[PDB]
Design a protein around this ligand. Structure first.
Ligand SMILES: [Mg+2]
Ligand SMILES: [Mg+2]
Ligand SMILES: [Mg+2]
Ligand SMILES: [Mg+2]
Ligand SMILES: [Mg+2]
Ligand SMILES: [Mg+2]
Ligand SMILES: [Mg+2]
Ligand SMILES: [Mg+2]
Ligand SMILES: [Mg+2]
Ligand SMILES: [Mg+2]
Ligand SMILES: [Mg+2]
Ligand SMILES: [Mg+2]
Ligand SMILES: [Mg+2]
Ligand SMILES: [Mg+2]
Ligand SMILES: [Mg+2]
Ligand SMILES: [Mg+2]
Ligand SMILES: [Mg+2]
Ligand SMILES: [Mg+2]
Ligand SMILES: [Mg+2]
Ligand SMILES: [Mg+2]
Ligand SMILES: [Mg+2]
Ligand SMILES: [Mg+2]
Ligand SMILES: [Mg+2]
Ligand SMILES: [Mg+2]
Ligand SMILES: [Mg+2]
Ligand SMILES: [Mg+2]
Ligand SMILES: [Mg+2]
Ligand SMILES: [Mg+2]
Ligand SMILES: [Mg+2]
Ligand SMILES: [Mg+2]
Ligand SMILES: [Mg+2]
Ligand SMILES: [Mg+2]
Ligand SMILES: [Mg+2]
Ligand SMILES: [Mg+2]
Ligand SMILES: [Mg+2]
Ligand SMILES: [Mg+2]
Ligand SMILES: [Mg+2]
Ligand SMILES: [Mg+2]
Ligand SMILES: [Mg+2]
Ligand SMILES: [Mg+2]
Ligand SMILES: [Mg+2]
Ligand SMILES: [Mg+2]
Ligand SMILES: [Mg+2]
Ligand SMILES: [Mg+2]
Ligand SMILES: [Mg+2]
Ligand SMILES: [Mg+2]
Ligand SMILES: [Mg+2]
Ligand SMILES: [Mg+2]
Ligand SMILES: [Mg+2]
Ligand SMILES: [Mg+2]
Ligand SMILES: [Mg+2]
Ligand SMILES: [Mg+2]
Ligand SMILES: [Mg+2]
Lengths: 177, 79, 66, 115
RNA sequence: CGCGGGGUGGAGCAGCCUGGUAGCUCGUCGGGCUCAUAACCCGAAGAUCGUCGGUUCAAAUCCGGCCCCCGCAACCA
RNA sequence: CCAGGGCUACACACGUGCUACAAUGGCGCAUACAAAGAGAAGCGACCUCGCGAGAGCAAGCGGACCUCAUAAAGUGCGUCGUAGUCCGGAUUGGAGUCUGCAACUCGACUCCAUGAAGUCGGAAUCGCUAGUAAUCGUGGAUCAGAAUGCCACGGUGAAUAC
RNA sequence: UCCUCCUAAAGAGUAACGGAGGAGCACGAAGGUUGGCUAAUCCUGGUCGGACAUCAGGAGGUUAGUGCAAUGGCAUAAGCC
């Protein structure tokens, strides 16, 4: 909630001066944050997925989508329409709420932390983080989980170059290398 | 590691280095003193330490100081 | 959002040992207790202390001193 | 029960709790609780949050966890870049402190192999 | 040339028929017992399945080609 | 005759040890009781400096005089409560200490952090008949320094031999 | 015996011990209809995670898919929900 109001007032006005934008709509805005959890090991144990779903459902507000396998492949021993991973595509109000909770409290709790990667952009301003542990978020109780599992966060923007997209996230006091 | 009463170098190597450094860079110094430490003034020189049967050239860098000369000259060859 | 299927997304007060009080909204319960935040974490000093570790020549001079 | 990087023990004495931190052992942990002014006989469940904050600043003095791990990784990696006897010892996977390598050295060399 | 059947650790055999993680008996290797060798007891390694290909999500196993190897036919004047 | 290097190499195999895998144990704080040695470029108090190896000052003794030398198991309280654990203490990084012209190949010990295998061991197989086995210290010889070996010493102290 | 392609000479048909492949079923949802959707394969970033499982954007545009051969056909989608 607060970062959306902060963005509207403080960030836009900061980004308008950098690349001398003609319009207020030209500024990059954050479209959606897609959390992803390719549990994978659900081939052997079916409940292990339902454990991951509950953990994503804890981490994010909303309940995740169980994502089916797109094609069958021999390398992992999986078939067409088999539940292999989990996802959440949170956006709008709960997204800004999650985005504060991520950068403000969770990202600091990363073990062996130093500085997040500046090179990590797709060439179209869309960022992605890879969190090793679920424990970094304070939603998970310590004596509940029993697996070194994690997720990946994926910040989607309306930017055009990673150069342009860096400033957007940098304006939120986002930690880079 | 031993020795708190001054880091140890052989008289002959100290005088040979002091004579080499003041004159300028030239060639690998034949030295048999592996026991001798490496001073800061030795940086730049490509001194040739005796491995046992021959002399191994060692270009002395900023990190090679507290370490002794024999550390950069493997004696026993294997495979 | 689909009501019923989601968990309870309630408001809560984060309060670290540093002193930074901060209300947020999440699926936890009653209250929170934290170690570090975006403020108070050693990254601005961390990178200053971590990079300036090396130094072999002065370490030699500190022993000999002549 | 969340100081430094990790430290999350329970039903364990405060002196033995802090051994679980990487970079803090038996004697260091007694120096923490001596400076903080906490009894060794108590446990973390018994302790309050007002006392745990003092332990956080105390272990911040010593180099611990990822700070230490990099300091060790740097010092080992330094030796290998020099190409000194110890560096060759490290990268070849053989014991460093002038040890016997003929019969034993199984810790450093690893388990048994065929011929 | 024609129709069956084969080709799998160093050897001889299963596994193929119904595609999904290759056994058995010897031999080789390490250790025991013995004065020593054998026998015996105890562990262990060792085959991508003739080869070139296709089908398939995946081939020792399905399907053709190429080279084997082996059987049966190769007849009436 | 001399400088270094090597006898200390390491896919592996065996011999002999030691330390383990714990709760009859581990860790603290208390305190019990030995013997046999050894010592003059020797053994080195006591006092100070040391977190500790040790560093100074130096008492005494060629010794039932002085010194190395508080024996440890053992009691007595505490605390961990069966965990790869407050078990194990390997391995590595750093900081050192003495000896010694010199410690990197290649020493010993200390401190700090690190915390590997290992949960009583396949076929086999060894010693031991009482102050013996078992377990806990201790000394000496060689020795500038360098024992888990060797050679001695004494604690608690069994089972079984039809 | 049946299906698909070529032989088959731009309607149909057309032989050979001519050239290549399939069928002897499957499905109460894989039918009906209504309302939606768009694919392959790469590129770059991202925890374990690697060429490839799951995510994001970009590139391509039907090389895809069509219960099973081949043919003709399908975005109005006959495709996937
Ligand atoms: Mg050679
Ligand atoms: Mg220790
Ligand atoms: Mg030793
Ligand atoms: Mg050696
Ligand atoms: Mg054969
Ligand atoms: Mg089968
Ligand atoms: Mg056999
Ligand atoms: Mg086998
Ligand atoms: Mg197979
Ligand atoms: Mg074939
Ligand atoms: Mg020898
Ligand atoms: Mg040695
Ligand atoms: Mg053995
Ligand atoms: Mg013990
Ligand atoms: Mg006496
Ligand atoms: Mg005395
Ligand atoms: Mg004394
Ligand atoms: Mg005293
Ligand atoms: Mg003294
Ligand atoms: Mg005497
Ligand atoms: Mg007297
Ligand atoms: Mg003594
Ligand atoms: Mg006791
Ligand atoms: Mg005791
Ligand atoms: Mg146990
Ligand atoms: Mg284990
Ligand atoms: Mg211990
Ligand atoms: Mg441990
Ligand atoms: Mg036992
Ligand atoms: Mg037994
Ligand atoms: Mg047995
Ligand atoms: Mg037996
Ligand atoms: Mg016997
Ligand atoms: Mg007898
Ligand atoms: Mg003994
Ligand atoms: Mg002793
Ligand atoms: Mg003596
Ligand atoms: Mg001894
Ligand atoms: Mg008919
Ligand atoms: Mg035609
Ligand atoms: Mg026609
Ligand atoms: Mg015609
Ligand atoms: Mg015809
Ligand atoms: Mg047919
Ligand atoms: Mg349907
Ligand atoms: Mg359906
Ligand atoms: Mg249909
Ligand atoms: Mg429709
Ligand atoms: Mg309707
Ligand atoms: Mg097609
Ligand atoms: Mg078609
Ligand atoms: Mg056409
Ligand atoms: Mg239909």
């Amino acid at each position: 909630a607060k970062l959306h109001d902060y963005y509207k007032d403080e960030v836009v006005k900061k980004l308008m001066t950098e690349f001398n934008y003609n319009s207020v709509m030209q500024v990059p805005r954050v479209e959606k944050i897609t959390l992803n959890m390719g549990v994978g090991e659900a081939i052997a144990d079916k409940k292990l997925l339902d454990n991951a779903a509950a953990d994503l459902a804890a981490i994010s507000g909303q309940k995740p989508l169980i994502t089916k396998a797109r094609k069958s492949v021999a390398g992992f021993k999986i078939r067409q329409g088999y539940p292999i991973g989990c996802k959440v595509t949170l956006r709008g109000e709960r997204m800004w709420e999650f985005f504060e909770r991520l950068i403000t409290i969770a990202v600091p709790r990363i073990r062996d932390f130093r500085g997040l990667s500046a090179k990590s952009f797709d060439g179209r301003g869309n960022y992605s983080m890879g969190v090793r542990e679920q424990i970094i978020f304070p939603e998970i109780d310590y004596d509940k989980v029993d697996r070194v599992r994690g997720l990946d966060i994926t910040i989607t923007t309306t930017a055009k170059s990673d150069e342009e997209g860096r400033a957007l996230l940098a304006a939120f006091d986002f930690p880079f290398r | 590691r031993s020795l708190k009463k001054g880091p140890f170098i052989d008289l002959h190597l100290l005088k040979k280095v002091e004579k080499a450094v003041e004159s300028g860079d030239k060639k690998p110094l034949r030295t048999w003193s592996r026991r001798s430490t490496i001073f800061p003034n030795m940086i730049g020189l490509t001194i040739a330490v005796h491995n046992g049967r021959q002399h191994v050239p060692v270009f002395v860098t900023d990190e090679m100081v507290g370490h002794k000369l024999g550390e950069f000259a493997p004696t026993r060859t294997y495979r | 959002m689909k009501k019923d299927i989601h968990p309870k997304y309630e408001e809560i007060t984060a309060s670290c040992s540093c002193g930074n009080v901060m209300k947020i909204r999440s699926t936890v319960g009653h209250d929170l207790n934290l170690d570090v935040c975006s403020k108070c974490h050693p990254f601005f000093t961390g990178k200053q202390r971590d990079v300036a570790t090396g130094g072999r020549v002065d370490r030699f001079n500190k022993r000999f001193n002549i | 029960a969340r100081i430094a990087g990790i430290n999350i023990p329970d039903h364990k004495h405060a002196v033995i709790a802090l051994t679980s931190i990487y970079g803090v052992g038996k004697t260091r942990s007694k120096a923490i609780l001596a400076a903080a002014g906490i009894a060794e006989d108590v446990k973390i469940s018994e302790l309050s949050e007002g006392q745990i904050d003092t332990l956080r600043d105390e272990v911040a003095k010593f180099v611990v966890e990822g700070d230490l791990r990099r300091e060790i990784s740097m010092s080992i990696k330094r030796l290998m870049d020099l190409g000194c006897y110890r560096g060759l010892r490290h990268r070849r996977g053989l014991p460093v402190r002038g040890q016997r390598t003929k019969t034993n050295a199984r810790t450093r060399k690893g388990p048994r192999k065929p011929i």
